[PDB]
């Protein structure tokens, strides 16, 4: 048996709290969440465990210190996060970008390119393709590495013609200028 009490604060870049929720779970079942409009715990579960969800709400509702805590909860978030929240919203790591061929898939094309993109944060990134400097349509969300960096890739299937130059165009805030990687058959 596993139980949770999940406090979750939602704040913008500025540090101004926009939402706050406090929820209680048992056996991966969300039982009751704080209801500010009601200034008390209210069961979110109306099923097999509903009975319990009520019970837990009351045991918590007769608690007094908790009630003030949660009524001022939205503040706690801003107060608790204050020191680092600016550093996190300012945190960005530059993406590395490497382009090479890869085994094709779901295509009649003989060649498949891969644009690799790693070591970047935050995860918001954009990848497009150029063929001799002109947009083309590619053949996803970044994979977190657990260490506050992300990786992703884009693909492009094609037929080689010696002269043609294919380009991967990455854009990411953790980098100052757009990153371009080229590739030619030859």
């Amino acid at each position: 048996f596993v139980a949770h009490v999940e406090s979750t604060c939602l704040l913008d870049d500025a540090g101004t709290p926009k939402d706050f929720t406090y929820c209680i779970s048992f056996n991966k079942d969300l039982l009751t969440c704080w209801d500010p409009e009601e200034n008390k715990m209210a069961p979110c579960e109306f099923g097999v465990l509903n009975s319990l969800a009520n019970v837990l709400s009351q045991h918590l509702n007769q608690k007094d210190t908790l009630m003030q805590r949660l009524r001022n909860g939205l503040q706690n978030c801003a107060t608790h996060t204050q020191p680092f929240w600016g550093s996190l919203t300012n945190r960005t790591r530059p993406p590395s970008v490497q382009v090479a061929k890869t085994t094709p898939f779901n295509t009649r094309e003989p060649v498949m390119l891969a644009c690799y993109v790693w070591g970047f944060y935050p995860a918001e990134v954009t990848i497009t393709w150029r063929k001799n400097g002109k947009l083309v349509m590619p053949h996803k969300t970044a994979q977190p590495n657990g260490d506050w960096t992300y990786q992703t890739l884009s693909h492009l299937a094609l037929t080689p013609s010696y002269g043609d130059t294919y380009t991967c165009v990455v854009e990411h805030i953790g980098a100052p200028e757009p990153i371009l990687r080229d590739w030619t058959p030859g």
């Binding site: 704040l11 048992f26 070591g119």
Partner: protein
């Protein structure tokens, strides 16, 4: 002015660890709590400074004690009346940087659908044990589930095959994930 999520998740369970606390900014983990030492442990060195902050010492204690209460008093009652929710964990292994032979790299073992949060992770090279660099970082996610990350430093070579072996410590269920060189990049 986009929004960001700060997640404060206290969880406790039958067996070890009997309790745990995970904070996270967006998806990624900032701190996990060491209760025997009674303090926040930073995921990365750069978070060290704010691990000391003790504004909420009481709030945390309250939750811990309550969460624990739920497990101890409720649960022996539901024991057998209600089925203990569990998932079978999923492991996948990938390189941190693009594969280039003879160039140092790092295998990441990403465990997902982990529930309950009770595991150990072990690496193997051609089916031979190998000491993994660093600890194993468990972390709660949205949905009341968990995930974990473990890393291994290595220098990839053509013939290599690696495996990551996860042991879900309730009933010691094993879940594996193989890795091999696939579409390596030329060096330039």
């Amino acid at each position: 002015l986009q929004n960001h999520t700060f997640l404060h998740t206290v969880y406790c369970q039958d067996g070890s660890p009997s309790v745990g606390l995970s904070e996270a900014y967006d998806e990624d983990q900032l701190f996990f709590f060491d209760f025997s030492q009674n303090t926040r442990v930073p995921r990365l060195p750069e978070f060290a400074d704010w691990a000391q902050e003790q504004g909420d010492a009481p709030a945390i204690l309250f939750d811990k004690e309550f969460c624990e209460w739920m497990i101890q008093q409720i649960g022996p009652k539901l024991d057998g009346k209600i089925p203990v929710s569990r998932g079978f964990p999923i492991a996948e292994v990938f390189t941190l940087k693009p594969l280039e032979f003879g160039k140092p790299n790092t295998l990441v073992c990403f465990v997902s659908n982990l529930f309950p949060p009770m595991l150990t992770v072990n690496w193997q090279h051609h089916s031979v044990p190998v000491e993994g660099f660093g600890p194993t970082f468990v972390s709660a996610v949205d949905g009341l589930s968990f995930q974990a990350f473990s890393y291994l430093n290595f220098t990839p070579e053509p013939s290599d095959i690696f495996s990551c072996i996860v042991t879900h410590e309730i009933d010691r269920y094993t879940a594996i994930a193989y890795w091999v060189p696939r579409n390596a990049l030329p060096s330039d």
